[PDB]
Design an enzyme around this catalytic site. Structure first.
Site, PDB file in Angstrom:
ATOM      1  N   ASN A  90     -10.367   1.988  -3.269  1.00  0.00           N
ATOM      2  CA  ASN A  90     -11.417   1.207  -2.623  1.00  0.00           C
ATOM      3  C   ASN A  90     -12.799   1.834  -2.758  1.00  0.00           C
ATOM      4  OD1 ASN A  90     -10.181   3.222  -1.001  1.00  0.00           O
ATOM      5  ND2 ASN A  90     -11.268   2.440   0.801  1.00  0.00           N
ATOM      6  N   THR A 106       2.878   0.383   7.818  1.00  0.00           N
ATOM      7  CA  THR A 106       4.078  -0.438   7.732  1.00  0.00           C
ATOM      8  C   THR A 106       4.486  -0.723   6.292  1.00  0.00           C
ATOM      9  OG1 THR A 106       3.581  -1.484   9.861  1.00  0.00           O
ATOM     10  CG2 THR A 106       5.095  -2.645   8.393  1.00  0.00           C
ATOM     11  N   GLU A 139       6.196  -9.616 -21.709  1.00  0.00           N
ATOM     12  CA  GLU A 139       5.480  -8.929 -22.777  1.00  0.00           C
ATOM     13  C   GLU A 139       4.647  -7.782 -22.223  1.00  0.00           C
ATOM     14  OE1 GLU A 139       6.181 -11.935 -22.460  1.00  0.00           O
ATOM     15  OE2 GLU A 139       7.173 -12.406 -24.355  1.00  0.00           O
ATOM     16  N   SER A 199       0.846  -1.180   0.000  1.00  0.00           N
ATOM     17  CA  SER A 199       0.000   0.000   0.000  1.00  0.00           C
ATOM     18  C   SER A 199       0.885   1.235   0.000  1.00  0.00           C
ATOM     19  CB  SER A 199      -0.940   0.024   1.212  1.00  0.00           C
ATOM     20  OG  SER A 199      -0.255   0.440   2.380  1.00  0.00           O
TER      21      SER A 199
HETATM   22  N1  LIG Z   1      -4.388  -3.276   1.862  1.00  0.00           N
HETATM   23  C1  LIG Z   1      -5.379  -3.155   2.740  1.00  0.00           C
HETATM   24  N2  LIG Z   1      -5.732  -1.915   3.219  1.00  0.00           N
HETATM   25  C2  LIG Z   1      -6.734  -1.792   4.112  1.00  0.00           C
HETATM   26  C3  LIG Z   1      -7.433  -2.904   4.570  1.00  0.00           C
HETATM   27  N3  LIG Z   1      -8.364  -2.427   5.446  1.00  0.00           N
HETATM   28  C4  LIG Z   1      -8.257  -1.071   5.535  1.00  0.00           C
HETATM   29  N4  LIG Z   1      -7.238  -0.670   4.706  1.00  0.00           N
HETATM   30  C5  LIG Z   1      -6.709   0.683   4.435  1.00  0.00           C
HETATM   31  O1  LIG Z   1      -5.322   0.564   4.148  1.00  0.00           O
HETATM   32  C6  LIG Z   1      -4.517   1.326   5.035  1.00  0.00           C
HETATM   33  C7  LIG Z   1      -3.372   0.466   5.566  1.00  0.00           C
HETATM   34  O2  LIG Z   1      -2.179   1.210   5.710  1.00  0.00           O
HETATM   35  P1  LIG Z   1      -1.298   1.067   7.053  1.00  0.00           P
HETATM   36  O3  LIG Z   1      -2.228   1.221   8.231  1.00  0.00           O
HETATM   37  O4  LIG Z   1      -0.191   2.091   7.099  1.00  0.00           O
HETATM   38  O5  LIG Z   1      -0.697  -0.427   7.018  1.00  0.00           O
HETATM   39  P2  LIG Z   1       0.768  -0.834   7.565  1.00  0.00           P
HETATM   40  O6  LIG Z   1       1.905   0.010   7.043  1.00  0.00           O
HETATM   41  O7  LIG Z   1       1.002  -2.285   7.223  1.00  0.00           O
HETATM   42  O8  LIG Z   1       0.737  -0.666   9.169  1.00  0.00           O
HETATM   43  P3  LIG Z   1      -0.597  -0.771  10.063  1.00  0.00           P
HETATM   44  O9  LIG Z   1      -1.041   0.605  10.493  1.00  0.00           O
HETATM   45  O10 LIG Z   1      -0.313  -1.553  11.318  1.00  0.00           O
HETATM   46  O11 LIG Z   1      -1.685  -1.470   9.280  1.00  0.00           O
HETATM   47  C8  LIG Z   1      -5.411   1.804   6.165  1.00  0.00           C
HETATM   48  O12 LIG Z   1      -5.189   3.175   6.410  1.00  0.00           O
HETATM   49  C9  LIG Z   1      -6.824   1.559   5.674  1.00  0.00           C
HETATM   50  O13 LIG Z   1      -7.417   2.794   5.356  1.00  0.00           O
HETATM   51  C10 LIG Z   1      -7.072  -4.179   4.094  1.00  0.00           C
HETATM   52  O14 LIG Z   1      -7.616  -5.234   4.441  1.00  0.00           O
HETATM   53  N5  LIG Z   1      -6.044  -4.278   3.179  1.00  0.00           N
END
Ligand SMILES: Nc1nc2c(ncn2[C@@H]2O[C@H](COP(=O)(O)OP(=O)(O)OP(=O)(O)O)[C@@H](O)[C@H]2O)c(=O)[nH]1
Ligand SMILES: Nc1nc2c(ncn2[C@@H]2O[C@H](COP(=O)(O)OP(=O)(O)OP(=O)(O)O)[C@@H](O)[C@H]2O)c(=O)[nH]1
Ligand SMILES: Nc1nc2c(ncn2[C@@H]2O[C@H](COP(=O)(O)OP(=O)(O)OP(=O)(O)O)[C@@H](O)[C@H]2O)c(=O)[nH]1
Ligand SMILES: Nc1nc2c(ncn2[C@@H]2O[C@H](COP(=O)(O)OP(=O)(O)OP(=O)(O)O)[C@@H](O)[C@H]2O)c(=O)[nH]1
Lengths: 427, 50, 438, 438, 427
Positions: free
Chosen positions: C206, C145, C254, C140
């Protein structure tokens, strides 16, 4: 792993926590004896963030009780859960307080800071790696402000790399009971503004108004007020201890609320407050929770931010929700009052979604607010000091201890700087 | 507490209020009591085999 | 042979990763135990799984992915799930501390002592792999994280392995929705770091994913389950060429060559045409024409872009299912004759077709349709620059009044690197209209 | 091939669209499930239904019509009907807000965000069509929602598709009966907006239909069910040439070319001769002679115009059933010898005959007769000007006293558009007057 | 979907609303406890127009009860359906009324508007899309006049795009009990005309006459009179809640009934009224319904329109009928009295057919008319106001709260203008 160690100070924080740990224990379902009744895997899972392990399945609370007066602790140890509390953690002084700030900050503290420091580091060495510490006390508390100001100073150099959570109740604006109380406010908040990183602001008058509005029960206990605030502290801590796609770490939060260093004062916000008939008169639906979430009446912290504007907004939701009702609801409120935010920053919402509902109600939340409503707070006290420092009331006690009015000069000067600081950022 | 719904009031409660297991998907009033032999068969018309 | 490695960074990138392997085990009929019934498919690990799974002599299909995260809750929670026995515990790399949404903290403070362990997995997976076309990165941009950690590792895998493809997939920040105000810091940080090392970036949003759910799927509250199921189908569709065959077979190599026009810009868009509710398509018909009318329809893309506000240069359609080329070329010719679709004249042809006879299957307990004729649309347009144009005016005001800077410089950083990106994003934007203008 | 797309606008015009489609499913024998019996008529969708229904390989007949309205009450209720499974959910274009009988409110306030949706249906219907000879529009002059919405929609379909035919069928306002007094307002607004874009408009009136019920059908208390049955029969007969064949086959294009004499005036009159109660037809005999005397009988018309007050220009006679030209051409020759039949000498011939061998069947639970020989009398006569002449002296009064003006100007309109319509109407009458003059 | 939220005000409207509300529940079949005993799908289907649904099958009315005197509310709360209404919806002040218009309009309303506007905007946020508001009150009622005139002004600026329905009762011409009532009426009707769009005119003297006429039971309860007027309001609302090819929206009707902006004052009309033996002595046929429907004795609102003529007439018919009988009955009245309408507009009839018969009878209808019979009403009060304004009786009270004769001058001058306006356009 990352854990939390608590400190309870001031005789209020004695009553504050004692409700607060029983809230935690009953939520986790431990009996008054201490033999955990295994019912939820997840509560057995993340109990280690606050409790260590004794022999036989007893989880010791990792918090240290500090005081000067016997009777206040005499109640809590004789209280329902004093047995789970540690006599090792019961540090105290052999003297009275007098509700004098300097005595606890210079006289009585000197022979007690050594013991408490040796104590707290012992539990610090017992555990591995903290998020930080949190403190239950009062800024208007005599012994609570006196001790904490000393300890927050000493803990800064000891561990300047953790979270200095502070939970202090603001006294009643109309009457402070204690007549020298404002003097204690200056002496506390002056040193607080540097050492702390987080501060919660709580007022009893609003808690009274909350009782008239939603409790509707006329005659409450102060323990009921302890129960209410414990629900507020519990909600933000449910984030860390419970699963669900929400990012819970206080620094994960603190960086999200704090744009500039001097912003330490924050106001809480809680979720559905109900009356005698409303329980079966309420359709527990996302709009009405959020509508009740953003109610000037559901405000409980200090005063109405209608007089000012909002710096940041952050509400964490507990229940079986989805990512879109939270998504659409913010748009509704964003369009509702777009102008009452600051043009400095748009979209100041910071939401977390906890999927593990409470025990007793399912759909809940908690809100933490930093608005432009603290001006009137220190404005209100400001006239008091300018008044009562005009001829120096009650001066001979503190000056006899070794106080000089020069200390008062900078303390007010620092706050008047904050007066402009909070003013200038928004105005 | 009371029962969640009267035995004949679920459908309209689900229709008027989508929280039928959280804010769930509801179809029209017509299909509320109908049998639903739909989830087993296919959707596409066919593949024209020459 | 024909295999690849999936990378899942950040707990945002892991529940989606859980779903795809849940989806992937279905079309291969993988039981949650990890083994087939008495039927004969196991051996030296050489069958449909050999490109995805590692089903060695032990008979257990080992997924070719690492699920790395810095908060243990969900990764341990999924370690209590259904397929945790399939998943390797130290391929489920966990972390004990988070980055507080800070790119640099996840890029400097903790990633150093973790990436080496991740590199151990990479090389020890590299040795057992044979062809390993490239890497599949799920992440993301606004990562608490995902942002910071991915940047450092995608550098390290680039420096040691600069000879192979790297396929990255992330959620684009929602243009008018932002869970926090840290993302404009880290996202633009990620963009400037990645562009000179990233190969081909694909974004999604999303809100439109939700929007389509109550448009045609008729779902007014989906969940990550469905959200991950949708994107899991997307990554499944693009990977069907590795699984099965068709009239012609194409590869990500490709894809890279024929999609990216020029260096820097490698940001196409993904779309799936036969997205529809359960009861709908039963009493109608879907053919090449209407889905092609659906595929390029301006409201059917998951990114908030109006194609009439830009111009097309690339368009890749991936016909998964049984279709004859006759109606295919006839339809796209009519699409070519369409005047509203304003391709750039630099490319006379811009259509890359991938035919795979295999019909896309459903997921049990799912919400999608059961369709034989399907297409995944991979296209790029210059109607995307306003997204970064949205972000820069979002960023420029905030940098002027320097909110939260004390947080970042507090942990050891400065403003020079932040300065680098604004002209770099200015470099990105001036490149877009110059290639846009004829 | 030979098909069209029907349009049904207005909660007046929604029940009538059901009945014809109900009537239509009888003659072709559609079971309410959506499929035939085990007998083979399904395929690529090419059989008697292909001109009206879209019965794809799923076997479900899809009516090629869209039901559009602005109140959910009736449409959801007919979505609770018996053939709702046949009906496409969002071809049943529902609404949440009304026009409050206001033409401009239904033309300006809400039309913007709905036409985009229906246009999507039109193009996604047009793409699957092959010949699409034209469109069948069901509406009403005194339309609370029929007036404003039909007028706006008939614009874009004209401007985007100006090469195909457009069939307009609507209830004419009752001459002396008025359920609403804003009806003259929107009606004259519709005429001045539609005269320059509509291809051919056909008007009917209820009162005479009620008058017919108790004269020969012998029903002093009929209903819409029989009313919509009669017009449902009317449109069924005109579509029999599309359905079945005859000695010669005629089409709407021939109808357009041979009916409208000159531009502007495209307003003929339709009449069905064998409208007789069931038991009467038993102990009597039907032949071309007496039924043709009935069709040219002055009181047989459903519209309050007096044939000997006017003069005839065109005449269409659709002989559906078992007839031979011999008695056919003899009877019409006698009509040419008839003196009361006063045609305009500009047309020595004005007769358009259409034969269809298929006999008109009864409907179960109906009130019609057992017709073997039938006809619809489609003709245009100068006797129509009095109706608009009735309208203007009606219209000129309240406009002088500007009744209800605050309502329409309150939502943002002015009197200039009310001004233009009156000389437009004056233009038609003087146009109607001059053409009547030899 | 489009919904309606009700307002209950004035010590009269305190009575009517409950009677109105209990009828609707009895119409829809909800028990007094609130657990709907589901029997009709359509009444189940279209209950959402007026009610929200709590937990466990409880339809909460979307109505607002406001007053000053508790005993009325306590009687209302102790009523058969007070449990169905919310203490949240029970809003009141801390003062007695005294039946003074301005005390509630200037003094008491000032600290009570904030509460109710918050309540009505809370319920406004609760509902999605509204037709508008309806208000049950009186024009001769002191508390209803003060609060009603205040709120109608306030509701205009907040939502000027909805339906501002008003339901008021005209005090008895022969005696007003309240001697200051003509002041109260003149003040209110002044404020009403600018802010309102619909006004129901009802007078109780006709109701007593009807009781002698068809009820024949000599001694009724005023609640029975409420049961009469509620049926009139129920029928006009049966249009919206029930299916059938009747065009139900008040705007659908308003543009049909209202030729010009100042026409707000209207008369109801109701269908079969039957006495003890005539229930089984009546041949219930559309002709005889229309006869009794168009009877000058069936008049109940103000007085006989025989003295004037008919501007707009509109009657909604409820039951299993057909277009043709209502059409021929429609043309009979045109031929019956062609001269007693205005030559301004012919075909002044508007008709809507509700196919859903009521519970208790099948053939029924409701009539709404705008005839030229209101001249006698305000001209009556004209002599009242002039004579009492001639020697300023009872004035020292209103000068005390802060009022002047100048406000009276324009209010009657506005009244005199509407006296002429009704006169010119018909005479
Ligand atoms: N990719 C993904 N994004 C989600 C999901 N649910 C909500 N989100 C959005 O995706 C963002 C995730 O980014 P981060 O919160 O920085 O993820 P991270 O860097 O792995 O660290 P964390 O805060 O612990 O999750 C959130 O701010 C949500 O708005 C999901 O299931 N998958
Ligand atoms: N425990 C408790 N404290 C209260 C209550 N109401 C107000 N307080 C305030 O909470 C403050 C905090 O208590 P402490 O900090 O422990 O007080 P202290 O330092 O011993 O000295 P004092 O503040 O003068 O009592 C007190 O100053 C009280 O004024 C209450 O109901 N219970
Ligand atoms: N076409 C048709 N008309 C009907 C039917 N029943 C009654 N009518 C007449 O058709 C008219 C309907 O016109 P409108 O009121 O403008 O209809 P609308 O524009 O769709 O919107 P509404 O005002 O809600 O009905 C009524 O005045 C009736 O006199 C019917 O079944 N079909
Ligand atoms: N409830 C009720 N009101 C009645 C009845 N008969 C006449 N009324 C009138 O209805 C009017 C409306 O009541 P409110 O508006 O609440 O009256 P108020 O503002 O409290 O002041 P008053 O009019 O003096 O009672 C009253 O003024 C009465 O004069 C009756 O039988 N019951």
């Amino acid at each position: 792993m990352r854990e939390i160690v608590h400190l309870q100070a001031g005789q209020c924080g004695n009553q504050i926590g004692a409700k607060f740990w029983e809230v935690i224990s009953d939520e986790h379902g431990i009996d008054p004896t201490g033999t955990y009744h295994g019912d939820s895997d997840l509560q057995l899972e993340r109990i280690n963030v606050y409790y260590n392990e004794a022999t036989g399945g007893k989880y010791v609370p990792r918090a240290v009780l500090v005081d000067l007066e016997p009777g206040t602790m005499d109640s809590v140890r004789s209280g329902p859960f004093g047995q789970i509390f540690r006599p090792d953690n019961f540090v105290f002084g052999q003297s009275g307080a007098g509700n004098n700030w300097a005595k606890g900050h210079y006289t009585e503290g000197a022979e007690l800071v050594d013991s408490v420091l040796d104590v707290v580091r012992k539990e610090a060495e017992s555990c591995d790696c903290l998020q930080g510490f949190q403190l239950t006390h009062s800024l208007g508390g005599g012994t609570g402000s006196g001790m904490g100001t000393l300890l927050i100073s000493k803990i800064r150099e000891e561990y300047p790399d953790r979270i200095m959570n502070t939970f202090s109740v603001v006294p009643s604006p109309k009457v402070s009971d204690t007549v020298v109380e404002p003097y204690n406010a200056t002496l506390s908040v002056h040193q607080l503004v540097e050492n702390t990183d987080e501060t919660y602001c709580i007022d009893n008058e609003a808690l009274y108004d909350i009782c008239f509005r939603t409790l509707k029960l006329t005659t409450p206990t102060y323990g009921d007020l302890n129960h209410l605030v414990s629900a507020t502290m519990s909600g933000v801590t449910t984030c860390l201890r419970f699963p669900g796609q929400l990012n819970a770490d206080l620094r994960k939060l603190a960086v999200n609320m704090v744009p500039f260093p001097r912003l330490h004062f924050f106001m809480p916000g809680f979720a559905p407050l109900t009356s005698r008939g409303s329980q079966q008169y309420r359709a527990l639906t996302v709009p009405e929770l959020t509508q009740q979430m953003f109610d000037a009446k559901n405000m409980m912290a200090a005063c109405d931010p209608r007089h000012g504007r909002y710096l940041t907004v952050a509400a964490v939701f507990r229940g079986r929700m989805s990512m879109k009702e939270v998504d659409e609801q913010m748009l509704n409120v964003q369009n509702k009052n777009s102008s009452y935010f600051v043009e400095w920053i748009p979209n100041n919402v910071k939401t977390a979604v906890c999927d593990i509902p409470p025990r007793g109600l399912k759909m809940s939340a908690t809100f933490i607010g930093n608005s432009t409503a603290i001006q009137e707070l220190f404005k209100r006290i400001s006239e008091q000091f300018t008044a009562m420092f005009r001829r120096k009331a009650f001066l001979h006690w503190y000056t006899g201890e070794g106080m000089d009015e020069m200390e008062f000069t900078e303390a007010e000067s620092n706050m008047n700087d904050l007066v402009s600081e909070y003013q200038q950022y928004q105005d | 507490p009371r029962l969640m719904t009267p035995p004949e009031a679920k459908k309209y409660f689900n229709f008027r209020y989508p929280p039928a297991g959280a804010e769930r998907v509801f179809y029209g009033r017509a299909n509320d009591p109908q049998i639903a032999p739909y989830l087993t068969h296919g959707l596409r018309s066919k593949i024209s085999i020459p | 042979m024909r295999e690849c490695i999936s990378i899942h960074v950040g707990q945002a990138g892991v529940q989606i990763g859980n779903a795809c392997w849940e989806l992937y085990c279905l079309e291969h009929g993988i039981q949650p135990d990890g083994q087939m019934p008495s039927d004969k498919t196991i051996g030296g690990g050489d069958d449909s799984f050999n490109t995805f799974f590692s089903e060695t002599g032990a008979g257990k299909h080992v997924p070719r992915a690492v699920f790395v995260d810095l908060e243990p809750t969900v990764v341990d929670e999924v370690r209590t799930g259904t397929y945790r026995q399939l998943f390797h515990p130290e391929q489920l790399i966990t972390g004990k501390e988070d980055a507080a949404n800070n790119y640099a903290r996840g890029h400097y403070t903790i990633g150093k002592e973790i990436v080496d362990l991740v590199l151990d997995r990479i090389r020890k997976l590299a040795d057992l792999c044979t062809g390993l076309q490239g890497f599949l990165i799920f992440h993301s941009f606004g990562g608490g994280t995902g942002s910071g950690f991915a940047s450092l590792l995608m550098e390290r895998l680039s420096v040691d392995y600069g000879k192979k493809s790297k396929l990255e997939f992330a959620i684009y920040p929602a243009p008018q929705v932002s869970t926090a105000v840290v993302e404009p810091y880290n996202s633009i940080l990620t963009t400037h770091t990645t562009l000179e090392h990233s190969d081909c970036a694909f974004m999604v949003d999303n809100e439109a994913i939700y929007d389509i759910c109550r448009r045609n799927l008729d779902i007014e509250r989906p969940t990550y389950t469905n959200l991950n199921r949708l994107i899991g189908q997307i990554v499944s569709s693009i990977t069907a060429s590795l699984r099965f065959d068709g009239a012609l077979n194409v590869d990500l190599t490709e894809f890279q060559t024929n999609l990216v026009p020029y260096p820097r810009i490698h940001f196409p868009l993904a779309t799936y045409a036969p997205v529809i509710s359960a009861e709908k398509a039963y009493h109608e018909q879907l053919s090449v024409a209407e889905i092609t009318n659906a595929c390029f329809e301006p409201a059917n893309q998951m990114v908030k872009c109006d194609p009439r506000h830009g111009k097309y240069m690339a368009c890749c359609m991936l016909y998964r299912g049984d279709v004859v080329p006759k109606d295919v070329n006839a339809a796209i010719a009519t699409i070519k004759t369409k005047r509203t679709i304003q391709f750039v004249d630099w490319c006379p042809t811009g259509f890359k077709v991938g035919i795979n006879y295999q019909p896309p299957t459903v997921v049990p307990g799912g919400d999608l349709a059961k369709v034989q004729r399907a297409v995944c649309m991979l296209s790029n347009t210059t109607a995307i620059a306003e997204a970064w144009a949205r972000l820069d005016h979002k960023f420029d005001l905030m940098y002027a009044k320097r909110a939260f800077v004390h947080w970042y410089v507090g942990e050891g950083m400065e403003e020079g690197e932040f300065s680098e990106a604004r002209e770099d994003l200015a470099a990105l934007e001036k490149d877009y209209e110059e290639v846009g203008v004829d």
